[PDB]
Amino acid sequence: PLIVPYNLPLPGGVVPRMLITILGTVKPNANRIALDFQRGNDVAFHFNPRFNENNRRVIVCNTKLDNNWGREERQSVFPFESGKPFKIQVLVEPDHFKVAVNDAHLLQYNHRVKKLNEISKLGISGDIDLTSASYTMI
Ligand SMILES: OC[C@H]1O[C@@H](S[C@@H]2O[C@H](CO)[C@@H](O)[C@H](O)[C@H]2O)[C@H](O)[C@@H](n2cc([S@+](O)c3ccccc3)nn2)[C@H]1O
Ligand SMILES: [Mg+2]
Numbered sequence: 001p002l003i004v005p006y007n008l009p010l011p012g013g014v015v016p017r018m019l020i021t022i023l024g025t026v027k028p029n030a031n032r033i034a035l036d037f038q039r040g041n042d043v044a045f046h047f048n049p050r051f052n053e054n055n056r057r058v059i060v061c062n063t064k065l066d067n068n069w070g071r072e073e074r075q076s077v078f079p080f081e082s083g084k085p086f087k088i089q090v091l092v093e094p095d096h097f098k099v100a101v102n103d104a105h106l107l108q109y110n111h112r113v114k115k116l117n118e119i120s121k122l123g124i125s126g127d128i129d130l131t132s133a134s135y136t137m138i
C-alpha cells in the first residue's frame with residue numbers, strides 16, 4: 001500500500017497504446033477521488049469521481065490551463081462503491097483517453113492538451129487506500 005497523494009512519474013509522457021492501471025480500495029465514507037494527468041502545472045486530464053454532489057454521485061472531467069478550469073464533461077455512470085476494491089485503466093488513444101473501471105468501459109475524454117509526450121506526471125489523490133499504480137504497453 002502506498003500513501004496518498006501519490007505521484008506516478010510518466011517519463012516521456014503518454015503515447016497511444018499506453019495502458020495506465022490504478023489499483024486501490026475506496027474508503028468507507030469517501031467523498032472524492034482524483035486522477036490528474038499533468039503537463040507542468042497544467043492538468044491535461046482531471047478525472048474526478050464525486051460521491052456526494054447534491055446527494056448525487058457523478059464523475060467530473062476537465063482540463064486546467066494557466067490555472068483556469070475549462071468546460072466540464074460529466075458522467076453519471078458511477079462504478080465506484082465505498083469500501084470496495086477498484087481498478088481504473090486509462091488507455092491512451094490518438095484522439096482521446098479511454099477509461100474503464102473494473103474491466104467495463106466508462107468514458108472517453110478528447111485530448112485538449114496535445115503534447116502527450118510532455119504529460120509527465122500522474123497525481124492520484126482522495127479518499128482511497130492506494131495499492132499500486134503502474135503502466136505498460138499493450
Ligand atoms: O471543473 C473541474 C473542477 O471543478 C471544481 S468545482 C466547479 O466549480 C465551478 C465554479 O468555478 C462550478 O461552476 C462547477 O459546477 C464546479 O464543478 C473543483 O474545485 C476542481 N477540483 C477538485 C479537486 S479534488 O476534488 C480536491 C483536491 C484537494 C482537496 C479536496 C478536493 N481539485 N480541484 C475541479 O474538479
Ligand atoms: Mg475519435
Ligand SMILES: [Mg+2]
Pocket residue numbers: 095
Ligand atoms: Mg471521437
